[PDB]
Amino acid sequence: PAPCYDPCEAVLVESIPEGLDFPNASTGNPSTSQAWLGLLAGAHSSLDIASFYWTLTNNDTHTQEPSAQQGEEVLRQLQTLAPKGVNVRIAVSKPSGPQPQADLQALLQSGAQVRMVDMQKLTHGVLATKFWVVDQTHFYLGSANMDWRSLTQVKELGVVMYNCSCLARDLTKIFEAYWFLGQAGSSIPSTWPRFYDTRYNQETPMEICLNGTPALAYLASAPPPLCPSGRTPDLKALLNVVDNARSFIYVAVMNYLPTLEFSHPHRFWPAIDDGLRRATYERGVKVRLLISCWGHSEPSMRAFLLSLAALRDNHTHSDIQVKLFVVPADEAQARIPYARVNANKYMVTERATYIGTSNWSGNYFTETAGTSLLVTQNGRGGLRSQLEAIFLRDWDSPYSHDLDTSADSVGNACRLLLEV
Amino acid sequence: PAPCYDPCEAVLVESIPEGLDFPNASTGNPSTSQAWLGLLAGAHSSLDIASFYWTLTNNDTHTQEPSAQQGEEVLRQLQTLAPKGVNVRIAVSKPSGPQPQADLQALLQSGAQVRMVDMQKLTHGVLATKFWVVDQTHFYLGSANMDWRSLTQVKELGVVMYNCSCLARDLTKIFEAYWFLGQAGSSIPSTWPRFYDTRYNQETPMEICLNGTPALAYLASAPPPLCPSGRTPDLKALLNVVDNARSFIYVAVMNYLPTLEFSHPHRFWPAIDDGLRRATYERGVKVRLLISCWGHSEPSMRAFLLSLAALRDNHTHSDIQVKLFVVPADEAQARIPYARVNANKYMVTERATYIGTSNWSGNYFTETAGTSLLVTQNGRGGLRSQLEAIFLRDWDSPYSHDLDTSADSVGNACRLLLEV
DNA sequence: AAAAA
DNA sequence: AAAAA
Ligand SMILES: *[C@@H]1O[C@H](CO)[C@@H](O[C@@H]2O[C@H](CO)[C@@H](O[C@@H]3O[C@H](CO[C@H]4O[C@H](CO)[C@@H](O)[C@H](O)[C@@H]4O)[C@@H](O)[C@H](O[C@H]4O[C@H](CO)[C@@H](O)[C@H](O)[C@@H]4O)[C@@H]3O)[C@H](O)[C@H]2NC(C)=O)[C@H](O)[C@H]1NC(C)=O
Ligand SMILES: *[C@@H]1O[C@H](CO)[C@@H](O[C@@H]2O[C@H](CO)[C@@H](O[C@@H]3O[C@H](CO[C@H]4O[C@H](CO)[C@@H](O)[C@H](O)[C@@H]4O)[C@@H](O)[C@H](O[C@H]4O[C@H](CO)[C@@H](O)[C@H](O)[C@@H]4O)[C@@H]3O)[C@H](O)[C@H]2NC(C)=O)[C@H](O)[C@H]1NC(C)=O
Ligand SMILES: *[C@@H]1O[C@H](CO)[C@@H](O[C@@H]2O[C@H](CO)[C@@H](O[C@@H]3O[C@H](CO)[C@@H](O)[C@H](O)[C@@H]3O)[C@H](O)[C@H]2NC(C)=O)[C@H](O)[C@H]1NC(C)=O
Ligand SMILES: *[C@@H]1O[C@H](CO)[C@@H](O[C@@H]2O[C@H](CO)[C@@H](O[C@@H]3O[C@H](CO)[C@@H](O)[C@H](O)[C@@H]3O)[C@H](O)[C@H]2NC(C)=O)[C@H](O)[C@H]1NC(C)=O
Ligand SMILES: *[C@@H]1O[C@H](CO)[C@@H](O[C@@H]2O[C@H](CO)[C@@H](O)[C@H](O)[C@H]2NC(C)=O)[C@H](O)[C@H]1NC(C)=O
Numbered sequence: 031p032a033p034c035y036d037p038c039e040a041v042l043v044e045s046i047p048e049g050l051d052f053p054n055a056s057t058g059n060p061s062t063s064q065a066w067l068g069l070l071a072g073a074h075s076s077l078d079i080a081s082f083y084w085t086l087t088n089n090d091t092h093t094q095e096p097s098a099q100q101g102e103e104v105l106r107q108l109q110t111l112a113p114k115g116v117n118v119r120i121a122v123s124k125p126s127g128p129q130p131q132a133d134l135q136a137l138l139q140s141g142a143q144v145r146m147v148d149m150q151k152l153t154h155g156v157l158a159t160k161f162w163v164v165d166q167t168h169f170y171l172g173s174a175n176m177d178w179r180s181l182t183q184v185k186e187l188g189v190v191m192y193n194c195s196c197l198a199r200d201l202t203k204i205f206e207a208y209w210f211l212g213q214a215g216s217s218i219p220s221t222w223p224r225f226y227d228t229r230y231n232q233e234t235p236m237e238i239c240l241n242g243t244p245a246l247a248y249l250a251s252a253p254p255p256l257c258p259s260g261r262t263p264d265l266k267a268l269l270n271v272v273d274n275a276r277s278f279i280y281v282a283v284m285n286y287l288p289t290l291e292f293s294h295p296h297r298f299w300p301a302i303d304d305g306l307r308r309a310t311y312e313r314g315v316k317v318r319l320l321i322s323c324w325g326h327s328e329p330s331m332r333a334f335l336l337s338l339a340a341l342r343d344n345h346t347h348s349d350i351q352v353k354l355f356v357v358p359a360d361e362a363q364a365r366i367p368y369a370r371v372n373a374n375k376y377m378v379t380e381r382a383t384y385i386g387t388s389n390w391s392g393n394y395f396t397e398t399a400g401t402s403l404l405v406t407q408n409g410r411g412g413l414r415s416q417l418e419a420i421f422l423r424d425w426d427s428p429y430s431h432d433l434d435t436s437a438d439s440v441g442n443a444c445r446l447l448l449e450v
Numbered sequence: 451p452a453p454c455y456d457p458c459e460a461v462l463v464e465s466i467p468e469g470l471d472f473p474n475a476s477t478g479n480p481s482t483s484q485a486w487l488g489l490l491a492g493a494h495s496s497l498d499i500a501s502f503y504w505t506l507t508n509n510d511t512h513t514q515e516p517s518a519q520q521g522e523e524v525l526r527q528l529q530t531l532a533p534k535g536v537n538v539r540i541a542v543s544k545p546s547g548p549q550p551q552a553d554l555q556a557l558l559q560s561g562a563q564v565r566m567v568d569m570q571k572l573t574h575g576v577l578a579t580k581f582w583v584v585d586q587t588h589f590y591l592g593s594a595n596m597d598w599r600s601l602t603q604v605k606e607l608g609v610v611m612y613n614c615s616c617l618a619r620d621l622t623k624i625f626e627a628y629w630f631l632g633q634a635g636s637s638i639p640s641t642w643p644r645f646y647d648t649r650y651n652q653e654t655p656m657e658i659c660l661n662g663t664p665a666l667a668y669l670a671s672a673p674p675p676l677c678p679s680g681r682t683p684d685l686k687a688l689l690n691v692v693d694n695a696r697s698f699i700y701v702a703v704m705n706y707l708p709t710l711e712f713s714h715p716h717r718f719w720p721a722i723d724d725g726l727r728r729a730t731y732e733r734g735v736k737v738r739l740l741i742s743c744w745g746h747s748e749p750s751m752r753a754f755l756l757s758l759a760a761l762r763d764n765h766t767h768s769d770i771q772v773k774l775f776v777v778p779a780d781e782a783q784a785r786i787p788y789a790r791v792n793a794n795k796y797m798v799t800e801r802a803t804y805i806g807t808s809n810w811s812g813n814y815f816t817e818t819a820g821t822s823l824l825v826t827q828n829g830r831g832g833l834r835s836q837l838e839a840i841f842l843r844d845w846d847s848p849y850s851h852d853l854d855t856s857a858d859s860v861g862n863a864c865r866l867l868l869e870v
Numbered sequence: 871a872a873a874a875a
Numbered sequence: 876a877a878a879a880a
């Protein structure tokens with residue numbers, strides 16, 4: 031494949047929730063809200079948004095919180111740019127219940143096309159892919175739902191990638207697949223049409239001029255059915271990256287459960303666990319795990335995390351460390367539903383970086399839809415170094431604790447920490 | 451296949467080392483030495499012995515211990531029955547070094563055919579199958595090497611199965627394969643001749659009148675190359691038995707390491723571990739692990755055992771308990787090489803029983819040769835109940851300790867227990 | 871934000 | 876008894 035001769039730059043945007051403060055003053059990136067506002071201001075031809083749910087108002091949460099202001103602003107911008115001529119298209123998973131949808135109808139009346147994709151009746155899951163494609167030259171990919179709490183109340187990790195028409199259209203292709211697949215009546219085709227096929231997969235990634243220095247990047251999609259022949263499955267890419275590492279593997283994910291949740295009877299899913307154990311045993315790879323715990327985390331997950339932190343010895347030089355990153359909450363933020371959590375889902379090695387939109391559980395890789403970006407840069411510094419610095423800042427943060435920490439000591443309510 | 455109309459009875463023989471005493475007086479079986487002596491006395495037509503090594507003298511150990519007397523007696527019997535007309539045939543793995551072999555030459559001069567099978571040059575391993583076939587009607591299968599220490603100094607678990615011409619010849623077939631395969635020059639055939647093929651495998655086991663009540667039994671062999679089309683691999687049978695269980699799984703094995711030992715670079719082998727985790731998570735199966743620790747155990751093994759004992763929670767009702775069975779030793783028994791250990795390798799469920807000759811490591815299932823017996827009896831009581839009683843006696847014995855036990859507290863030297 | 875028999 | 880670079 032011909033290299034993409036475009037000034038593809040890339041910014042690691044993150045939304046630090048109020049209260050959280052890293053006392054380093056050395057790493058600084060635009061927040062998710064700032065990047066989204068800039069993309070909307072620069073949007074003049076197209077805007078494709080794949081989202082899980084839309085809660086850009088204090089109305090939909092039934093809360094009176096000023097912190098939603100930024101989110102409301104985004105909604106206002108989304109209302110203003112539709113009449114200007116931008117072909118706004120939004121794919122949002124069909125809600126389980128018939129709850130009112132103020133934002134979606136507000137954009138529909140303005141002129142924004144909305145299609146209700148229903149993953150439950152197609153592959154038995156939800157559509158949890160959160161990404162943007164702006165003018166088909168820039169794009170966004172991260173853990174930020176189209177919510178005000180996502181912008182302010184929870185922590186995110188995403189990439190805004192500018193001037194990359196080639197990686198922007200390869201990402202759209204997924205949005206086009208969602209658009210065609212979830213309009214009405216139509217089901218998953220046996221064979222995907224060539225329009226959705228891609229050429230930049232794991233064996234032949236795409237060459238970009240990522241800040242001048244050449245780099246190899248490509249996107250991975252899920253669930254396996256909604257995947258064309260060219261596209262590399264998200265699980266396969268994740269396993270390849272965790273296997274190719276030879277020095278260290280740093281993982282910061284919201285939820286890591288090696289089981290097929292959201293289904294019964296309970297099923298065991300040892301896919302990422304086996305890869306982590308292989309990498310940490312056969313090779314001297316040091317594995318560092320950073321999970322996030324809140325009030326809506328499965329208490330069984332600890333029982334698996336303890337199964338990994340206990341595998342470390344001298345003879346094979348095994349080294350696995352597991353830490354929980356819990357976002358502190360107060361009385362004011364307690365009343366907000368799904369208020370405080372670290373939703374970042376990514377990992378970084380000494381030779382590659384993976385940034386995804388789905389938690390590390392069997393559903394997100396076999397049923398729930400998701401998208402991830404893989405970047406490998408030959409050289410010292412760059413995107414990989416920036417993400418490694420982000421992960422170490424997270425790792426040494428006061429909010430990151432060991433698996434033996436007392437739950438009451440942590441500010442927020444954690445179900446994975448035994449009391450006293 | 452037609453059922454084997456033979457009074458196939460079955461005795462669980464075990465060799466309790468001196469010093470060990472279970473204060474129950476309710477379970478009693480003939481020792482391995484007694485059963486071997488009875489088989490030799492009743493031997494008049496044939497005697498096939500597959501063994502790892504031959505140390506039936508105080509000479510070969512270079513020790514002066516009266517406890518070898520029984521072993522010497524066995525050797526004497528093995529010398530006496532050869533001139534009587536018994537076709538004694540012994541398959542013993544070729545030693546790494548050119549050490550003297552008094553017992554093998556003593557039997558060779560009497561008239562016992564000995565063939566030096568060399569597993570290292572054939573499949574890259576050793577021949578660790580310990581079994582007897584006496585007159586092709588009885589047989590023995592257990593963890594007892596042809597050693598005096600095996601008979602007295604270490605603990606064993608084996609089956610002597612009388613009046614079973616059908617299960618005796620199915621076991622011989624393996625000895626015939628070893629005999630032909632390890633004579634001289636000849637290598638492993640691509641396709642095994644029909645003479646070594648068997649009909650009683652996992653899908654179609656053999657029906658026997660095991661103490662009157664019908665039962666389904668069959669044998670499994672390793673390594674996968676020295677296996678005909680009919681024969682079921684040992685690993686496949688082990689996985690099937692650990693998967694079919696629905697209530698509990700009790701495992702008492704000498705060494706359980708989910709790695710490919712005896713080879714470099716270090717390799718990860720998550721085959722039995724994954725099955726145990728699946729059984730204990732998907733179903734409410736209670737898994738109890740009884741490992742044995744001595745002075746020649748890999749210290750890394752604890753790092754994996756802690757990975758299993760830490761997987762137990764309420765939401766999925768997971769329950770895995772790991773215990774170490776350490777045979778106490780004194781100053782007198784310390785000087786004996788490979789003196790005190792619990793060498794039993796078996797497991798029992800609520801519906802099946804597995805008795806093997808090899809430890810639970812990757813080599814023993816992929817390179818090292820081994821044989822195991824599988825029995826499933828429909829009813830309450832019988833062989834399965836006897837083995838379950840044996841396992842619970844072992845589990846509650848004072849010699850069985852938890853993984854957090856202090857090493858100095860245990861009588862013997864254990865490398866898997868952290869000091870103080 | 872995929873917690874919700 | 877498969878501990879032995
Ligand atoms: C590849 O090329 C792209 C294109 O330039 C680079 O993207 C730039 O990345 C740098 C650093 O990652 C960004 O610089 C940082 O911007 C942050 C956001 O600035 C906006 O928001 C603040 C909010 O108050 C406004 O005041 C400001 O005017 C902007 O609107 C700043 O917060 C950062 O400052 C932090 O670091 C400095 C030290 O440098 C400290 O003194 C500060 O206190 C603070 O801690 C910083 O300035 C830049 O904005 C990005 N550009 C764009 C267009 O997004 C990629 O980084 C590059 N890739 C690599 C690997 O280098
Ligand atoms: C299917 O059928 C076969 C054929 O009979 C059964 O095999 C018999 O199994 C029973 C019990 O498992 C055996 O009985 C036990 O024998 C032990 C060994 O006895 C020999 O060694 C002692 C050593 O001193 C000699 O004294 C003795 O004369 C024998 O030469 C005994 O040690 C056992 O005694 C224990 O239990 C009793 C209570 O019953 C206590 O009072 C004792 O103190 C001691 O704790 C016991 O007698 C029998 O020997 C086996 N027969 C053969 C030929 O091997 C299978 O058991 C059967 N299967 C099932 C499931 O029932
Ligand atoms: C993506 O590509 C566009 C197109 O090149 C970038 O916009 C360009 O940004 C540069 C500097 O950021 C601008 O250069 C400046 O121009 C002004 C006059 O407009 C001049 O006074 C300055 O000294 C400087 O030279 C350039 O004009 C501008 N071009 C356009 C068409 O907007 C954009 O910055 C790229 N994205 C990122 C994240 O860098
Ligand atoms: C395997 O099969 C052989 C053959 O049947 C069994 O040997 C038989 O054992 C029974 C009792 O154990 C003997 O019965 C006894 O016979 C004597 C006379 O010899 C009699 O006085 C007793 O009252 C009793 O009836 C039988 O004779 C004997 N037969 C032979 C040919 O040895 C053997 O016991 C079986 N194996 C096991 C473990 O049971
Ligand atoms: C919710 O949306 C409505 C209309 O878009 C706005 O407030 C509602 O309408 C009037 C005020 O305009 C009030 O009498 C209603 O009680 C309001 N509804 C609610 C649920 O408060 C406003 O845009 C939104 N309300 C907010 C953000 O509080």
Ligand SMILES: *[C@@H]1O[C@H](CO)[C@@H](O[C@@H]2O[C@H](CO)[C@@H](O)[C@H](O)[C@H]2NC(C)=O)[C@H](O)[C@H]1NC(C)=O
Pocket residue numbers: 344
């Ligand atoms: C063997 O492992 C031990 C601990 O598992 C190592 O000892 C130290 O352990 C602490 C806490 O785990 C570490 O912070 C140190 O870095 C370890 N090393 C030293 C020198 O203090 C020990 O180093 C390992 N290796 C050997 C040869 O004993």
Ligand SMILES: *[C@@H]1O[C@H](CO)[C@@H](O[C@@H]2O[C@H](CO)[C@@H](O)[C@H](O)[C@H]2NC(C)=O)[C@H](O)[C@H]1NC(C)=O
Pocket residue numbers: 507508509
């Ligand atoms: C070892 O075998 C030899 C011959 O089979 C026996 O003892 C050896 O020979 C004479 C006594 O017959 C002694 O002078 C030697 O010193 C003995 N050898 C050793 C190593 O002691 C006897 O059968 C065996 N020796 C034992 C069991 O101590």
Ligand SMILES: *[C@@H]1O[C@H](CO)[C@@H](O[C@@H]2O[C@H](CO)[C@@H](O)[C@H](O)[C@H]2NC(C)=O)[C@H](O)[C@H]1NC(C)=O
Pocket residue numbers: 764
């Ligand atoms: C939940 O788990 C706890 C412990 O993991 C159970 O509490 C007791 O724990 C001890 C020691 O582990 C056991 O010996 C008891 O059998 C457990 N039960 C009781 C009633 O004491 C607890 O039972 C589990 N279930 C619930 C509903 O809490």
